[PDB]
Enzyme design. Structure first.
Site, PDB file in Angstrom:
ATOM      1  N   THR C 136      63.007   1.525  73.219  1.00  0.00           N
ATOM      2  CA  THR C 136      61.854   1.894  73.944  1.00  0.00           C
ATOM      3  C   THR C 136      61.371   3.236  73.607  1.00  0.00           C
ATOM      4  O   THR C 136      59.960   3.315  73.406  1.00  0.00           O
ATOM      5  CB  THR C 136      62.023   1.320  75.469  1.00  0.00           C
ATOM      6  OG1 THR C 136      60.733   1.677  75.965  1.00  0.00           O
ATOM      7  CG2 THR C 136      63.057   2.374  76.015  1.00  0.00           C
ATOM      8  N   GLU C 245      47.513  28.230  68.423  1.00  0.00           N
ATOM      9  CA  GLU C 245      47.874  28.958  67.864  1.00  0.00           C
ATOM     10  C   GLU C 245      49.410  29.059  66.991  1.00  0.00           C
ATOM     11  O   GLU C 245      50.070  30.024  66.918  1.00  0.00           O
ATOM     12  CB  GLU C 245      47.642  30.677  68.063  1.00  0.00           C
ATOM     13  CG  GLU C 245      46.572  31.225  68.707  1.00  0.00           C
ATOM     14  CD  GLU C 245      46.358  32.440  69.330  1.00  0.00           C
ATOM     15  OE1 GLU C 245      45.289  32.818  69.839  1.00  0.00           O
ATOM     16  OE2 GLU C 245      47.132  33.118  69.315  1.00  0.00           O
TER      17      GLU C 245
HETATM   18  N1  LIG Z   1      69.841  15.045  75.388  1.00  0.00           N
HETATM   19  C1  LIG Z   1      69.828  14.038  75.892  1.00  0.00           C
HETATM   20  N2  LIG Z   1      70.017  12.694  75.147  1.00  0.00           N
HETATM   21  C2  LIG Z   1      70.107  11.511  75.826  1.00  0.00           C
HETATM   22  C3  LIG Z   1      70.143  11.482  77.285  1.00  0.00           C
HETATM   23  N3  LIG Z   1      70.485  10.034  77.545  1.00  0.00           N
HETATM   24  C4  LIG Z   1      70.322   9.525  76.479  1.00  0.00           C
HETATM   25  N4  LIG Z   1      70.116  10.438  75.387  1.00  0.00           N
HETATM   26  C5  LIG Z   1      70.231  10.092  73.945  1.00  0.00           C
HETATM   27  O1  LIG Z   1      69.336   8.767  73.663  1.00  0.00           O
HETATM   28  C6  LIG Z   1      69.925   7.925  72.805  1.00  0.00           C
HETATM   29  C7  LIG Z   1      69.527   6.612  73.053  1.00  0.00           C
HETATM   30  O2  LIG Z   1      68.290   6.449  73.629  1.00  0.00           O
HETATM   31  P1  LIG Z   1      68.025   6.387  75.227  1.00  0.00           P
HETATM   32  O3  LIG Z   1      67.225   7.372  75.645  1.00  0.00           O
HETATM   33  O4  LIG Z   1      69.574   6.558  75.802  1.00  0.00           O
HETATM   34  O5  LIG Z   1      67.506   4.962  75.457  1.00  0.00           O
HETATM   35  P2  LIG Z   1      66.012   4.352  75.480  1.00  0.00           P
HETATM   36  O6  LIG Z   1      65.356   5.590  74.687  1.00  0.00           O
HETATM   37  O7  LIG Z   1      65.390   4.426  76.794  1.00  0.00           O
HETATM   38  O8  LIG Z   1      65.937   3.219  74.565  1.00  0.00           O
HETATM   39  P3  LIG Z   1      66.614   1.929  75.060  1.00  0.00           P
HETATM   40  O9  LIG Z   1      68.160   1.540  74.734  1.00  0.00           O
HETATM   41  O10 LIG Z   1      65.730   0.667  74.531  1.00  0.00           O
HETATM   42  O11 LIG Z   1      66.380   1.812  76.781  1.00  0.00           O
HETATM   43  C8  LIG Z   1      71.334   8.263  72.712  1.00  0.00           C
HETATM   44  O12 LIG Z   1      71.799   8.163  71.285  1.00  0.00           O
HETATM   45  C9  LIG Z   1      71.557   9.558  73.347  1.00  0.00           C
HETATM   46  O13 LIG Z   1      72.025  10.482  72.579  1.00  0.00           O
HETATM   47  C10 LIG Z   1      70.030  12.662  77.853  1.00  0.00           C
HETATM   48  O14 LIG Z   1      70.115  12.663  79.201  1.00  0.00           O
HETATM   49  N5  LIG Z   1      69.903  13.895  77.014  1.00  0.00           N
HETATM   50  N1  LIG Z   2      46.742  48.964  71.123  1.00  0.00           N
HETATM   51  C1  LIG Z   2      47.011  47.604  71.546  1.00  0.00           C
HETATM   52  N2  LIG Z   2      47.160  46.604  70.695  1.00  0.00           N
HETATM   53  C2  LIG Z   2      47.372  45.541  71.110  1.00  0.00           C
HETATM   54  C3  LIG Z   2      47.266  44.868  72.355  1.00  0.00           C
HETATM   55  N3  LIG Z   2      47.765  43.744  72.471  1.00  0.00           N
HETATM   56  C4  LIG Z   2      47.674  43.129  71.181  1.00  0.00           C
HETATM   57  N4  LIG Z   2      47.531  44.306  70.398  1.00  0.00           N
HETATM   58  C5  LIG Z   2      47.505  44.261  68.830  1.00  0.00           C
HETATM   59  O1  LIG Z   2      46.600  42.907  68.425  1.00  0.00           O
HETATM   60  C6  LIG Z   2      47.448  42.252  67.267  1.00  0.00           C
HETATM   61  C7  LIG Z   2      46.992  40.625  67.852  1.00  0.00           C
HETATM   62  O2  LIG Z   2      45.752  40.486  68.135  1.00  0.00           O
HETATM   63  P1  LIG Z   2      45.141  39.323  69.016  1.00  0.00           P
HETATM   64  O3  LIG Z   2      45.721  39.211  70.511  1.00  0.00           O
HETATM   65  O4  LIG Z   2      45.808  37.755  68.464  1.00  0.00           O
HETATM   66  O5  LIG Z   2      43.644  39.020  68.785  1.00  0.00           O
HETATM   67  P2  LIG Z   2      42.636  38.121  69.133  1.00  0.00           P
HETATM   68  O6  LIG Z   2      42.892  36.989  68.126  1.00  0.00           O
HETATM   69  O7  LIG Z   2      41.105  38.567  69.076  1.00  0.00           O
HETATM   70  O8  LIG Z   2      43.004  37.717  70.556  1.00  0.00           O
HETATM   71  C8  LIG Z   2      48.918  42.337  67.661  1.00  0.00           C
HETATM   72  O9  LIG Z   2      49.381  42.567  66.029  1.00  0.00           O
HETATM   73  C9  LIG Z   2      49.072  43.553  68.183  1.00  0.00           C
HETATM   74  O10 LIG Z   2      49.566  44.865  67.607  1.00  0.00           O
HETATM   75  C10 LIG Z   2      47.172  46.353  73.278  1.00  0.00           C
HETATM   76  O11 LIG Z   2      47.111  45.973  74.621  1.00  0.00           O
HETATM   77  N5  LIG Z   2      47.023  47.579  72.781  1.00  0.00           N
HETATM   78 MG   LIG Z   3      67.085   2.418  78.433  1.00  0.00          MG
END
Ligand SMILES: Nc1nc2c(ncn2[C@@H]2O[C@H](COP(=O)(O)OP(=O)(O)OP(=O)(O)O)[C@@H](O)[C@H]2O)c(=O)[nH]1
Ligand SMILES: Nc1nc2c(ncn2[C@@H]2O[C@H](COP(=O)(O)OP(=O)(O)O)[C@@H](O)[C@H]2O)c(=O)[nH]1
Ligand SMILES: [Mg+2]
Ligand SMILES: Nc1nc2c(ncn2[C@@H]2O[C@H](COP(=O)(O)OP(=O)(O)O)[C@@H](O)[C@H]2O)c(=O)[nH]1
Lengths: 48, 430, 430, 430
Positions: C136, C245
């Site tokens: 699923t 971004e």
């Molecule tokens: N990280 C993480 N992985 C999980 C968890 N529970 C299940 N899994 C993973 O999910 C895989 C199987 O899918 P599930 O999510 O358990 O079951 P499902 O996606 O609902 O699919 P169905 O079996 O048809 O119900 C297993 O191989 C687990 O590794 C969880 O709580 N945490």
């Molecule tokens: N002097 C100064 N530089 C800044 C500041 N905040 C971000 N910058 C510079 O601006 C760059 C990023 O620009 P950005 O925020 O993406 O510009 P925008 O895309 O127009 O929003 C980074 O490399 C920083 O060095 C600030 O408060 N002061």
């Molecule tokens: Mg299940």
């Protein structure tokens, strides 16, 4: 080698540019006319 | 002297008047009990323009309220300042029109109109020197757009030399509340051009746009649209009730803004308008007023004024200010926008100054401009009309009360002719 | 005015969604009942008076987990009819959840998605969680992604998939549906993050010193990573980063968007305060191969681009002084056509602690999202596992009898071969 | 008279302005509520340069703030002196650019820029005598480097005779926070040379170096870099707001520092700068100011000025001092360093004196020198650009929004031509 590499593709885009320029040159040259509307207006104003 | 009477019809017109009279009473310091409590001497000198005098010292508006159903007038009486209206002027029927133009103009509106015409004649014959009449009604409703326009013709037939004003709300295609709006709009525009000396179109869509963009208030209601329309209405006749540097009655505007007798459809706008949070930032100066006055979004109509050229323009400044600045700014607004002003009539902007500003404001401006851009509204109205009429949809309701399709064809043809001959002067050159 | 919607499908998806939704509610001060006793708007919505509703939807065909959710302490939080539940489980069969029972449920989920999206005004994108090795989960994730890619188009979608471990496995048939789901989301998801369980088990064992971990401990670390990724949208920072971004900074080519994550520091309160946790040492620990959140060796491949987020009281100059040290080291080498490969974000809000959890409270933390050429090993080993059983057509009858065609297995194999060839083609120097 | 308006874009530009306006307000004694509380008469004589007048006696900056996302302006409003900015001047979009130059210059930036251009036109048409515009933006971001540069061209097209300033932060390869910096840096430099009358490059790396070595403070933050940039910004226009021995407006500097119209990229520096513990040891004298002014580490750019020869130089002394000492010291700094000054233009140092020193300091100097050593920055930017472009990395993001590789090739060629023709005069001899 790197500086040597810096030339050929750019020359080919310019040639392509010449045909595009030729069409605009032609296009600018095509011109046509707007006298008919003026004649027609002259006609429209006369009725008015 | 040179006073006017108020006549309103329909629900929309009654709601407009319910705020217009409140604004006038607040301007003249009249309490909702009809007792004067003003501060300045000038508040009483020209009160005969809108108010009559009765025994006991109280004042009563010379307004006439008419509708084909009693609900709206039974509701406006319970509102604030509702007691000022004389009970005798209330005339109503027991049936209503149901947004059907034929019922409100041929069958039901014809029999009732005698009683309202009686009181109209009583009011006009009595007054010192008549200036004219002003009419508020909506073109989107049946009873209003029928009875009001027939009353226009009846009044014009008896007073051919007086002036006639009409503030008309036309149905916009954006915010549509009635499906049969094009029919009674097109039928009404046919009769309105033949008799009204002045017409001022107002659109709900433009009012919502203004309220949302300039005032920036969250929840517009009909009370705000009515307040804006009321301020615009009051601004026109301000100098007729107060002294000023250059007084200019309604007839003077009629002379200067109508080049040809069939071109009398204006669109208006009011300045200044600012939000509550920005009312402290701004400084009120003549340049600030004139830049907002010619702003396209400030017009009370959705029509875009930079899609055409102004035939003429008018401005009614309020407050105490220097005339030299006003004239130079009017010249500047006309030199920088020469493309949007027709060239075969030079100096096509009229200005006037009144020394009494609105209560609470130091400067105000009312703008009335005759432009060729108004053609777009009639174009879309006629487009919807011809889209609906070609299938004869909803036609039986109108044809069952003595009306025929020939009057529809003539109305469409006359409206299209008006549209064409209004733009004829847009392409005219010297 | 910035929003994001998280989608949880399958048992693993719901169990990690629970983990992230305790953390968000704790971080924004909202009680489990949903009542507070302007940063919440990214994940929540205001109901007008009182409670907040998460912008999340829970999906599953097997009702046990949803029923557990609807009776726990968080029964009052989620809207009652956004916890869509089925009746019959797919039972680890991918063809079931893509062709047989998922189609009848997907329409309700899409209706809920529309009803949630119309409320948002500044929708940044979607988040989706699904364990890949299940019927699923993989099937419904594929179908939902395919529907969303055409309903909305250019909106960004992020996928936090959990691939199976190299040798540790719970099922016996998970390579088949893992390969098919990778096929499905290769051309349909903008970002995919690796999350296999074995690496996180090793992290817990080595750092947290827990010898008997359960799934909750893993899900809490994943929730912390999600919070670190999305902190920049709801807290003030000196160097902000938005979700949109990313494809401009981490995704060199449209096909290559699988990257692996890491987090630092991970330490218990019993020995956390004995050391100063400077920014240099945490940014060194984050780049350690043993602290990768997916069981892959970065020493076996080049780096393409590194996007790494800080939060707390970190100063930019200290960050630059540590990026220089990493560029200095000879054991970490970047690809030739990328001179600078680091995108740095700095936020002021320190990570929040969950009571009764494993992690302690610290003032500085770093989360890195790094795209590297070494990821091809997991694809190669999954492909090798798939080929062994597909040679004899084992377990295929469980898929052919659920409406899937015979040839559908081959084209996923061809797409994986294409991806592996592309990863080799990109990593060669010019 | 001869006043200028402030326009800023992007997050970096907004943060620069948030300190520039604080510095200006503290210099003129304006409280964060807009009320004057200064001590000297001269503090009000030329306040029309940067501040407008409104009713109630408060002052409002004529600044225009634009960004493609609302977060930064929603944050700057809550900071100190954030209430001075008029709410009407805030214009923003709902989507953002995601550091993608194409999105901020072709698709999203094109539609929004009409609203900001409206308020820009409102501000410029009104003012007494325009001197020009000053622009603060960053070349390392998408929305900034796109929308700002397109706005530069739009402003230049309408006001060809006015002067234009740009304070541009270029991405250094040492402290890199974004992987796609070379693309939008190279694209922006192409457009910036064609329209800007003056350009002043600022680098974060040089600011960190200065803060660590001269001020010797332990933990630099963006507030210190912003403060240094703000002091440097204020120093340029000081004599235009205060009396002095030799007044010199921006146009006079433009005449004397730009030999050829395409060579207008300067690097600046501010003196004096001393640590807190050594502020009592030092004595402020003209030799002490001029020895620190020409110091290589004092430049606001990582470019090494003894790797090239100055085409010209400028100095704006502040405070009351003798002119004879200034002239003799300028001569001495030019006789002892004849190898680093181009020989075919004699007397290539401009000096100016303003009698009003900064608040808290008795003497100050702002240095603006046009040198050939700036070629190294464009060299490394183009090197990274050509290293990344040869593999077409991250190119699809730009090409998916109507842009093509031809505009990249033309930009690279024009930038290389600029690099070559800027050093052409370094080897020129008489
Ligand atoms: N990280 C993480 N992985 C999980 C968890 N529970 C299940 N899994 C993973 O999910 C895989 C199987 O899918 P599930 O999510 O358990 O079951 P499902 O996606 O609902 O699919 P169905 O079996 O048809 O119900 C297993 O191989 C687990 O590794 C969880 O709580 N945490
Ligand atoms: N002097 C100064 N530089 C800044 C500041 N905040 C971000 N910058 C510079 O601006 C760059 C990023 O620009 P950005 O925020 O993406 O510009 P925008 O895309 O127009 O929003 C980074 O490399 C920083 O060095 C600030 O408060 N002061
Ligand atoms: Mg299940
Ligand atoms: N400004 C304003 N317009 C209104 C108000 N009430 C109704 N309208 C407009 O009037 C139109 C309907 O007119 P209607 O009530 O049928 O007129 P009637 O047939 O004469 O009663 C609608 O399209 C509304 O936009 C109001 O209180 N204020």
């Amino acid at each position: 080698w790197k500086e040597k590499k810096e030339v050929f593709d750019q020359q080919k885009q310019k040639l392509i540019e010449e045909q595009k320029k030729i069409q605009e040159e032609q296009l600018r040259r095509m011109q046509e006319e707007k006298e008919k509307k003026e004649k027609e207006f002259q006609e429209f104003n006369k009725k008015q | 002297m040179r006073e006017i009477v108020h006549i309103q019809g329909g629900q929309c017109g009654n709601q407009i008047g319910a705020k217009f009279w409140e604004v006038i009473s607040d301007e003249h310091g009249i309490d909702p009990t009809g007792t004067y409590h003003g501060d300045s001497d000038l508040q009483l000198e020209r009160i005969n323009v809108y108010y009559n005098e009765a025994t006991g010292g109280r004042y009563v508006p010379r307004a006439i309220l008419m509708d084909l159903e009693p609900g709206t007038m039974d509701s406006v009486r319970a509102g604030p300042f509702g007691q000022l209206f004389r009970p005798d002027n209330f005339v109503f029927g027991q049936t209503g029109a149901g947004n059907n133009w034929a019922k409100g103009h041929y069958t039901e509106g014809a029999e009732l109109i005698d009683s309202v015409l009686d009181v109209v004649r009583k009011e006009a014959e009595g007054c010192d020197c008549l200036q004219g009449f002003q009419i508020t009604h909506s073109l989107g409703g049946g009873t209003g757009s029928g009875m009001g326009t027939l009353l226009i013709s009846k009044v014009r037939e008896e007073y051919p030399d007086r002036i006639m004003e009409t503030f008309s709300v036309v149905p916009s295609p954006k915010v549509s509340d009635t499906v049969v709006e094009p029919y009674n709009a097109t039928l009404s525009v046919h009769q309105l051009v033949e008799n009204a000396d002045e017409c001022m179109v107002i659109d709900n869509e433009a009012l919502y746009d203004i309220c949302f963009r300039t005032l920036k208030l969250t929840t517009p209601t009909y009370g705000d649209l009515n307040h804006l329309v009321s301020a615009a209405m009051s601004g026109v006749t301000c100098c007729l009730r107060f002294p000023g540097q250059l007084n200019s009655d309604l007839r003077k505007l009629a002379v200067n803004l109508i080049p040809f007798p069939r071109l009398h459809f204006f669109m208006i706008g009011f300045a200044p308008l600012t939000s509550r949070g920005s009312q402290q930032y701004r400084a009120l100066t003549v340049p600030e007023l004139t830049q907002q006055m010619f702003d396209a979004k400030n017009m009370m109509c959705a029509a875009d004024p930079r899609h055409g050229r102004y035939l003429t323009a008018s401005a009614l400044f309020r407050g105490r200010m220097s005339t030299k600045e006003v004239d130079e700014q009017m010249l500047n607004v006309q030199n920088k926008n020469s493309s949007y002003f027709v060239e075969w009539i030079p100096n096509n902007i009229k200005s006037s100054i009144c020394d009494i500003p609105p209560k609470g404001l130091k400067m105000a401006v009312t703008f009335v401009g005759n432009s060729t851009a108004i053609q777009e509204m009639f174009k879309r109205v006629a487009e919807q009309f011809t889209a609906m009429f070609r299938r004869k949809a909803f036609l039986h309701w109108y044809t069952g009360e003595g009306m025929d399709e020939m009057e529809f064809t003539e109305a469409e043809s006359n409206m299209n002719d008006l549209v064409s001959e209004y733009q004829q002067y847009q392409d005219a050159t010297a | 005015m910035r929003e994001v919607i998280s989608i949880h499908v399958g048992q693993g998806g719901i169990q990690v969604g629970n983990a992230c939704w305790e953390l968000f509610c704790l971080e924004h001060g909202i009680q489990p009942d949903g009542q507070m006793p302007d940063a919440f708007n990214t994940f929540f919505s205001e109901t007008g008076a009182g409670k907040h509703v998460p912008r999340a939807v829970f999906l599953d065909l097997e009702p046990t987990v949803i029923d557990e959710v609807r009776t726990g302490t968080y029964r009052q939080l989620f809207h009652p009819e956004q916890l869509i539940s089925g009746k019959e489980d797919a039972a680890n069969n991918f063809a079931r959840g893509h062709y047989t029972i998922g189609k009848e449920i997907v329409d309700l989920c899409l209706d809920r998605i529309r009803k949630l999206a119309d409320n948002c005004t500044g929708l940044q994108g979607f988040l989706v969680f699904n364990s890949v090795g299940g019927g699923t989960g993989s099937g419904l994730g594929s179908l939902l992604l395919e529907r969303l890619s055409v309903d909305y188009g250019k909106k960004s979608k992020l996928g936090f998939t959990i691939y199976p471990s190299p040798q540790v496995s719970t099922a016996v048939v998970e390579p088949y549906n893992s390969i098919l789901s990778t096929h499905s989301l290769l051309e349909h998801t903008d970002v995919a993050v690796m999350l296999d369980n074995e690496a996180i088990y090793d992290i817990c064992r080595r750092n947290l010193d827990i010898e008997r971990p359960t799934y909750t401990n893993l899900n809490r670390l994943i929730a912390q990573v999600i919070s670190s990724l999305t902190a920049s949208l709801r807290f003030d920072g000196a160097l902000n980063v938005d979700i949109t971004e990313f494809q401009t900074n981490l995704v060199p080519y449209p096909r290559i968007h699988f990257m692996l994550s890491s987090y630092a520091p991970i330490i218990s309160a019993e020995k956390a305060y004995h050391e100063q946790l400077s920014v240099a040492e945490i940014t060194n620990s984050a780049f350690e191969p043993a602290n990768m959140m997916a069981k892959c060796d970065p020493r076996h491949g080049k780096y393409m681009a590194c996007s790494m987020m800080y939060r707390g009281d970190v100063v930019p100059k200290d960050v630059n002084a540590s990026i220089a040290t990493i560029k200095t080291k000879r054991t970490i080498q970047f690809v030739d056509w990328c001179p600078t490969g680091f995108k740095v974000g700095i936020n002021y809000q320190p990570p929040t602690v969950v009571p009764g959890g494993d992690l302690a409270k610290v003032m500085r933390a770093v989360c890195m999202i790094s795209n590297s050429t070494a990821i091809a090993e997991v694809f190669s080993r999954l492909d090798h596992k798939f080929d062994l059983m597909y040679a004899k057509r084992a377990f295929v009858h469980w898929y052919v009898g659920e409406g899937m065609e015979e040839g559908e297995f081959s084209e996923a194999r061809e797409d994986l071969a294409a991806l592996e060839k592309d990863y080799e083609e990109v990593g060669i120097e010019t």
